[PDB]
């Protein structure tokens, strides 16, 4: 999925993997998150002219797993 945030003049974008903001995942206004298997939250700190704001965030929600198909029981057929 592709996240999208505000473009701010003078800004530096820091994306983090956790609300603790100790480890980076990316640096972009529109980063891609890949191989998503669980709901995942990214946090964003925008620093403008040296001023770092409160991180914003959003959670990418993973669609439910589709149901297993209904097929017939083991069968047997006679040749021909």
């Amino acid at each position: 999925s592709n996240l999208s945030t505000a473009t701010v003049s003078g800004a530096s974008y820091a994306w983090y993997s956790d609300s603790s903001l100790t480890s980076l995942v990316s640096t972009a206004q529109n980063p891609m998150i890949v191989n998503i298997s669980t709901d995942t939250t990214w946090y964003l700190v925008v620093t403008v002219n040296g001023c770092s704001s409160v991180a914003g965030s959003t959670t990418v929600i993973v669609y439910p797993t589709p149901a297993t198909p209904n097929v017939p029981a083991n069968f047997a057929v006679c040749e021909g």
Binding site: L24, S26, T27, V34, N35
Partner: peptide
Amino acid sequence: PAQPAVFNDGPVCEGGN
């Protein structure tokens, strides 16, 4: 001025890029 961050675009398959 500062050490840059460098990011990969994911795992690469052997012989790829």
